[PDB]
């Protein structure tokens, strides 16, 4: 469809190849990253007042352990 | 086939081949190529090496 | 004008070769030729001198509103590199 | 790119200069030199006046004499008015530079 795995490789290094067995591992890395973020976000969601919302503002406070900052609104 | 009384036993039996490891290694090289899954079905079912 | 070979001779190391050489022996190196073990000492000097110069800047802006090094000049200088040191002053 | 280069070469010699003229203003692959090679045999004269700034500034591997020759196409055949007072400077510079590359 669009941006499966190869165009992201071109986004960094124009001439780089990945083995067939490496692609699935990276997706599982992303799959584990997705679950870890949402579980922690839901934990903070239940911490605001026992539950409020999935909030983009508290996600910024969550990314301090990942040492990353989204260029979003905030 | 069931009424021939000879081909029915043919299906319910396997053809054993006593080959060297190099010959099997030659065979194991060819079977990995494209369009060989159907041939591999006979090997895993009908022929014991 | 002059290549790096004799410029390597011009440097005057402070850490003896018996300290850097022992580090290579711990990691599994011979440490038996003079030439490779001078950059690690220079790299070690650069790493400490940058902290030393940073501590000097903090010390010279302490209370101006002889030179003694305390924890007030060490815990902020080590903060940028990621070193977090916190020692209790009593008990 | 060998396929593209030979396709351009084959089409140029088959009298298909109109197709290459329209190819020079596609969404991408902007090639001003290709336009300058193909647009002087048709009525499309507006493309030449635009595709000269990036032609001169790019300095593509000592390719100044051919651009100077291409400057005469707009000077000799100009729609509104052209003074035709610097044609001698054009040919003298082109001839001197052509001889200069002859010695190379």
């Amino acid at each position: 469809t669009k941006k499966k795995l190869q165009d992201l490789v071109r986004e960094v290094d124009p001439n780089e190849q990945l083995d067939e067995d490496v692609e699935e591992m990276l997706l599982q890395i992303a799959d584990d990253f997705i679950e870890s973020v949402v579980t922690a976000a839901c934990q903070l969601a239940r911490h605001r007042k026992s539950s409020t919302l999935e909030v983009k503002d508290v996600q910024l406070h969550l990314e301090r352990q990942w040492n990353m900052w989204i260029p979003g609104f905030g | 086939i069931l009424s021939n009384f000879k081909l029915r036993a043919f299906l319910d039996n396997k053809y054993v081949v006593r080959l060297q490891e190099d010959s099997y290694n030659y065979l194991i090289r060819y079977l990995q190529s494209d369009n060989n899954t159907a041939l591999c079905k006979v090997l895993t079912l009908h022929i014991h090496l | 004008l002059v290549d790096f070979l004799m410029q390597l001779e011009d440097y005057t190391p402070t850490i003896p070769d018996a300290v850097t050489g022992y580090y290579l022996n711990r990691a599994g190196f011979e440490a038996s030729d003079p030439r490779i073990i001078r950059l690690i000492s220079l790299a070690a000097q650069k790493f400490i001198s940058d902290i030393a110069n940073d501590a000097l800047q903090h010390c010279k802006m302490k209370g101006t509103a002889k030179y003694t090094l305390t924890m007030e000049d060490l815990t902020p200088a080590l903060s940028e590199y990621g070193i977090n040191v916190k020692k209790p002053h009593y008990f | 790119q060998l396929w593209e280069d030979h396709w351009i070469r084959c089409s140029k010699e088959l009298n298909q200069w109109e197709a290459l003229t329209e190819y020079g203003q596609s969404k991408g692959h902007i090639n001003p030199y290709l336009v300058l090679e193909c647009a002087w045999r048709v009525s499309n004269w507006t493309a030449m006046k635009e595709a000269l700034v990036q032609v001169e500034v790019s300095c593509p591997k000592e390719m100044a004499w051919k651009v100077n020759m291409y400057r005469g196409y707009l000077a000799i055949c100009h729609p509104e008015e052209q003074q035709l007072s610097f044609i001698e400077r054009l040919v003298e510079m082109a001839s001197s530079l052509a001889i200069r590359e002859w010695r190379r």
Partner: protein, 39 residues
């Protein structure tokens, strides 16, 4: 064990995924060919 995974019903990512895919920037004449035929 690896090539059987790309032959045992993996056409959903091969003949359906790869359809209507934009051409690579190395081949820039196919779009011109399509435009000439359409026009």
């Amino acid at each position: 064990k690896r090539c059987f995974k790309r032959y045992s019903r993996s056409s959903l990512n091969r003949q359906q995924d790869l359809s209507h895919c934009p051409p690579p920037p190395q081949l820039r004449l196919l779009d011109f060919l399509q435009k000439r035929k359409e026009r």
